[PDB]
Amino acid sequence: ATRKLNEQGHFGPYAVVLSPRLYSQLHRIYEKTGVLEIETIRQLASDGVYQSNRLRGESG
Amino acid sequence: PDFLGHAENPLREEEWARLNETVIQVARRSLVGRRILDIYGPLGAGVQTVPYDEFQGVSPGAVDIVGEQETAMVFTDARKFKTIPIIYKDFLLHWRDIEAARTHNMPLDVSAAAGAAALCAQQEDELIFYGDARLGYEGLMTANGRLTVPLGDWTSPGGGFQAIVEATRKLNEQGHFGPYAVVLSPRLYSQLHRIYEKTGVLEIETIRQLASDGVYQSNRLRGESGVVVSTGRENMDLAVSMDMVAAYLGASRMNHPFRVLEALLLRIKHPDAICTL
Amino acid sequence: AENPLREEEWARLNETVIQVARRSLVGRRILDIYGPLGAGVQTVPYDEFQGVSPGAVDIVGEQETAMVFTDARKFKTIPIIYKDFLLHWRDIEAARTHNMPLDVSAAAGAAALCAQQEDELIFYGDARLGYEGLMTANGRLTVPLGDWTSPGGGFQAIVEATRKLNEQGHFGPYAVVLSPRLYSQLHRIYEKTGVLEIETIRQLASDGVYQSNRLRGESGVVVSTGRENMDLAVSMDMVAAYLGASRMNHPFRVLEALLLRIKHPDAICTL
């Protein structure tokens, strides 16, 4: 998604909104070493990764 | 010209302060109900009755260019007020112990105070989580419209997540979603607290991220059950008339028995935000 | 037949005893004490337990349920624990003129022995005299601490101990005391991701996980740190006193007067 934004010449500090199912289940803590997968996504986004229960099941 | 008699309060000021501090702190330690819920502020001793609003409403808001929806949400027939009970225990303190704590060995012992207040809070949490038919009250695991969902999948390495997932799905089906909070029985909670789910870390971390208001433990619940609720107001409440406090009943044979008071009543203003086994 | 030391040396001796005490006492970091009652008292009141009275009457007005009180009133005698050492008059004179350390190694040894005896007393009552031992108490809620030396080890036992405490309606901020063998070997750093197993146990307990080399090889306990559950009646804190000169050599004795009164023996788990 970030490379598709950048290809379109539209970048910056991104933000992410995920459905609660994923935003909970995404805590697959083991990426490889010690850091939460959601934490590394947040490092990639740099303006938070929020959840909103109003979204559908598998969307973000 | 001494301790004997049926006089008023025997305890001095600082002793009263220590008694009150002990009951308050052991209450704060032992209360799990008053964390998942939220309380209508202390009304006072006098207030014996509080309103008990009717039931659910499937009426949502609406947005139009010019406000004409009329957004009705009206109670229909009555209001069926209810009354606030009381819960208490005993403080059988010896007179010789009080006498010793004046001119002699003086660590005034109030262990019975902490024990009695712990029992009182346990009974109160039993009240919230289970109504008693004698007073005709409603309990979270015995209300009407609990939106039941089977569990039938624990004792497996990872057969606990999908139960709360299904509970959340059913709770959102009624158009009632928000910050969920879960309360579980002791053995169920410990079993949930087991080793990695084979897809990350301990299951309770994922469950706590999914709930967003914590997973709590209650010994007072039955063996193999638990609930998930919507923590906001406009859905549930805990009307408090007066918080835990120790008061002097009377004079026993020669001792002094006390009693700890607190008047609480749960109000399920919206019995849609309850889910169980 | 006199009084040997002046203020400075007395203060140094007392400070050394206090330092070795506060270093070696493990019990004082898990139990809170009943205020120092003075040397006068020798007896204290005792527990209240199995007060099975729901008190959950929950009726407008009030019912007449049973009040909670001591199950059977009785008393216990506060022991005295002491260690004796010796000093030489020539040593004092030398420390007064030639050099000025005033060697107090004997005092440190005495304080260490006294503290070890005290901790053994707390973790094991004296069977001959007859007291209550944390690993020999009645109503101990034993839980099998076995099947360790495994990836998922002490966690599976601590969670079971906590659920047994909570089932008994007795919870709060727990504390854990483990034998040194385990408290070292428990550092099986890999739970799954990055956090010490002892660190996650400490997160579960929330009032420390201490070790005490006085325990046996494969034993450990978990308790509820609050008062009104466990207590430590103190009559006087560890202090050094003078036994009177004999043959010009000055003896000395370090004293402590402690007794634990387990009010609510429901906060116990063992092997």
Swiss-Prot record, chain B:
Biotech utility: The encapsulin and a cargo construct (an encB-encC-encD fusion) can be overexpressed in E.coli and in human HEK293T cells. In HEK293T in the presence of 0.5 M ferrous ammonium sulfate nanocompartments can be detected and used as cell markers. Coexpression of this nanocompartment with a larger nanocompartment from Q.thermotolerans (AC A0A0F5HPP7) allows expression of different sized iron-rich particles. The encapsulin shell proteins do not seem to mix.
Phenotype caused by lack of the gene: Does not form fruiting bodies. Decreased survival when grown under oxidative stress (0.5 mM H2O2).
Broad class of the protein's primary localization: other
Keywords: Encapsulin nanocompartment, Ion transport, Iron, Iron storage, Iron transport, Transport
PANTHER family in the record: PEPTIDASE U56 FAMILY (PTHR37165), TYPE 1 ENCAPSULIN SHELL PROTEIN (PTHR37165:SF1)
Further remark: Shows substantial structural similarity to gp5 of the HK97 viral capsid, and while the sequence homology is weak, it suggests this protein may have evolved from a viral capsid protein.
Name of the protein: Type 1 encapsulin shell protein EncA
Source organism: Myxococcus xanthus (strain DK1622)
Underlying gene: encA
